Amino acid sequence: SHMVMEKPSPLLVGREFVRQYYTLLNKAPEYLHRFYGRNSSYVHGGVYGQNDIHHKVLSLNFSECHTKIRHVDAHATLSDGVVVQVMGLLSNSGQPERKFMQTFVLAPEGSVPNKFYVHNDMFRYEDEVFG
């Protein structure tokens, strides 16, 4: 029983990504599109293409967005990718906290080497789905 040297642990890649993702969302939301490729999908309910994602984020207007991460779980998936499920609270522009469930699919960048990009991003508010 030894540690895998070839690939980074999926759980650490997910947690570190979530940490940086929501941090940048609070700081500079306009640079958030740099996490996605020209084939990624962004859904914030409430889109395929990085340029469409950039315009999508700006249309949401994130002004000092604070996030309380309640749960994060990340596993390894297809083609050495990482799938992450995130549950927590979201408060944007002074509005009160809203329970959400955001899921990511972290894909390894082409080359090289240990670089990842968001291949899938699905965001859903709880009060809009259940009530």
Binding site: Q20, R34, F35, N114, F116, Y117, V118
Partner: peptide
Amino acid sequence: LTFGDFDE
């Protein structure tokens, strides 16, 4: 471990 076009 880097994400996107960042060196952080």
